[PDB]
Amino acid sequence: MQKARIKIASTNVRSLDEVANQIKQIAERTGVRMSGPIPLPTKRIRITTRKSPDGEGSATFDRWELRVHKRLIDIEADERAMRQIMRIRVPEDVTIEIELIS
Amino acid sequence: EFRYRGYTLEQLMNMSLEELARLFPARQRRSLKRGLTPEQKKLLRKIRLAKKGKYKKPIRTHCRDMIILPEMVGLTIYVHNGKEFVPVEIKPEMIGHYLGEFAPTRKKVEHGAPG
Amino acid sequence: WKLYEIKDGKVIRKNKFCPRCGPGVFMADHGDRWACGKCGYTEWK
Amino acid sequence: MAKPSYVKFEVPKELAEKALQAVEIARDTGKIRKGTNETTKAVERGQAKLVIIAEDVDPEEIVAHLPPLCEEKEIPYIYVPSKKELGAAAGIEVAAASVAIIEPGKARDLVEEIAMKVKELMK
Amino acid sequence: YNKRKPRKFGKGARRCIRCGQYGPIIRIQGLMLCRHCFREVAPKLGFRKY
RNA sequence: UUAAUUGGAUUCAACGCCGGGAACCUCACCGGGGGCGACGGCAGGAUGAAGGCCAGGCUGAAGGUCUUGCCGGACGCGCCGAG
């Protein structure tokens, strides 16, 4: 038994759900078992900074957030199934990284 | 007579640099071990062969952090305080202290009536 | 031009050619040495 | 006028004009070294192919050493009446005492011709 | 002799790309930008308000 | 007080403030050392660089200065405007 682990990461949630949905359709169309997409913990990058450019005024601070969501999909070996993933249109924001595990 | 670490200046002259730095405090020995600056070594050559007499120029330096060795004893060096190269006269007790401690870069601060 | 003398049909060079770079590299005549400042190379006479 | 001391032959006007044209063409489509210093450096290196020397150079010692220098190194040297002519032929506003060609470019057909017209002059 | 000395540490080793301010340059994962510059560009980097 | 505590900021609403970093930098402070103002114009020109560089005296050192002498081979200083 051999498996492929795919991690799909995006800031946009809807792009990620569309990519996952088309991967699911591909995996069920090729009839190869797929582990359901496990949504791994989303990374919240936080940066705070003082609003005022100079040093004047009340101590005012602004919070800036980046929520980036990533998901894990594991599939069983099938060269036909792996041929169709490189043709998947991937949006500019979604990054897909694929590794092969025994 | 002058005694440092249990030894005299004229006995301090003949020891090598490694043992001599072993007798030193941790900071000065660490600075000596990690290596003198190239300007520090140029100035060391200058004063060393000035002791022998060949370099007859009045010796002046910026190396406020020069550490005085026992072999340098018996000389005069002008150390920069920030505006002028103030003289300092090397005696046998100089051993174990930096140059910049000794030149006044902050003049005396007296106090008067409040404004 | 002033560093090439000529007698009897042959060229005398007023200064020694520096072997590091090649011909046309005269040397500095100090009496006690032959020096070239292109790299600070000195050959003591 | 008396010919300078370094003169070893009399170059005709037409031959001097051909030498100037060769200087211009070698400047245009070749390589020339301007100045007696660089002429000497090239002749000593052997790269020189033909050395043009002005005949109204006020200090003789600048061009005094060129004729025997080129004879010893077996490279033809030719004369031109005016230093300003050689400077104009060299494409520079200042006056060129001598020009040493390195790449004849399109002046070979002149320079090689000039070669015999130089080799006949020393005979 | 006009080149500035190399510095791998300290404030002088660091300079904002945009305005060149030697001072506040936040480095959360390597932004390399002055703090005041950050305000007018954070949405362009995707940052939102919540 | 200082050779400097660079300057700014004022009752709230300046005062762990400009600085989300004052050992060299941060520099904007003090004292000292050295160094290029481009381009159009005059003049000069290469009959040799304006840069390098010994040996060294003077410069904190740094061809930095100076006697120094050769160099890579090629056009660059002072002014008028003017960056």
Short mmCIF file of C-alpha atoms (C1' of nucleotides) in Angstrom, two decimals, chain A residues 50 52 55-59, chain F residues 8-18:
data_model
loop_
_atom_site.label_atom_id
_atom_site.label_comp_id
_atom_site.label_asym_id
_atom_site.label_seq_id
_atom_site.Cartn_x
_atom_site.Cartn_y
_atom_site.Cartn_z
CA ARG A 50 0.75 52.14 16.95
CA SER A 52 0.02 57.59 15.22
CA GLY A 55 4.77 60.03 19.13
CA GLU A 56 1.82 62.31 19.90
CA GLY A 57 -1.61 61.46 21.24
CA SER A 58 -3.18 58.73 23.28
CA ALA A 59 -1.59 55.30 23.11
"C1'" G F 8 10.99 68.02 18.60
"C1'" A F 9 6.89 67.70 21.96
"C1'" U F 10 3.09 71.22 27.39
"C1'" U F 11 -2.44 71.23 31.80
"C1'" C F 12 -5.84 67.55 30.64
"C1'" A F 13 -4.69 66.29 25.04
"C1'" A F 14 4.59 66.24 26.16
"C1'" C F 15 6.54 63.42 30.25
"C1'" G F 16 8.81 53.95 29.38
"C1'" C F 17 6.38 60.41 24.12
"C1'" C F 18 8.94 60.95 18.21
#
